[PDB]
Amino acid sequence: MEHVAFGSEDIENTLAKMDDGQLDGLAFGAIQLDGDGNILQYNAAEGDITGRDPKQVIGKNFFKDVAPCTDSPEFYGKFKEGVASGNLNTMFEYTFDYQMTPTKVKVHMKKALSGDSYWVFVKRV
Ligand SMILES: *C(=O)/C=C/c1ccc(O)c(Cl)c1
C-alpha cells in the first residue's frame, strides 16, 4: 500500500514516479486523463469503487463513453475550465450512478506534472 493520503498538497509530485503497478497501491481511486478526457491510467481502487475493469477503460473517453453522469458543468465543466486555465485543483463531492448502484464519492481533480495530463482522484464518502 503506497503511503499517500487523499488530498495531499504535493500529490502530483508523489504520483509522478508511479507506474501502473504502484498506482494500484494507492488507498483511493486515481484516474489520469488527457486534456480531452481520454483515460491514460486507471488504478485498482477506482475499479473497486466503480466496477469497471482498469485495463478495459484505458483509451476510452471518460466524459463521453465511460462516465456520462459526469458530463455536466459540475464535473466535466470544472475539468475543462481547469485544463484551459492550466491550474486545475478542485475538490467536490459527486454521485456516480451510470449502470451502477449510486455511489457518493469525494473527487479531487488536479493537474499532473506531465503537462497534458490531469488527475481525477476518488474516495468513498
Ligand atoms: C457516472 O456516469 C460516472 C461513472 C463513472 C465514474 C467513475 C469511473 O471511474 C467510471 Cl469507470 C465511471
Q: Is the CB of 64 under 6 A from ligand 1?
A: no
- CA distances 16 to 12, 32, 125, Å, are 6, 11, 26
Q: Taking Cα atoms as reference points, which of 3, 87, 125, 15 lies closest to residue 109? A: 87
CATH architecture for the domain at 1-125: 2-Layer Sandwich (3.30)
Residue in the block written with cell 471518460: 62
Output the CA 66–ligand 1 centroid distance in Å.
6
Q: Is the CB of 109 under 6 A from ligand 1?
A: no
Q: Is the CB of 46 under 6 A from ligand 1?
A: yes
* Secondary structure letter of residue 70 according to DSSP: G
Residue 29, helix vs strand vs coil? strand
- CA distances 11 to 67, 71, 96, 100, Å, are 24, 25, 23, 29
Residue in the block written with cell 470544472: 78
What resolution in angstrom units was achieved for this structure?
A: 1.7
- What are the extents of the domains in the chain? 1-125
Q: Which three cell numbers stand for residue 74?
A: 459540475
CB 118 within 8 A of CB 111: yes
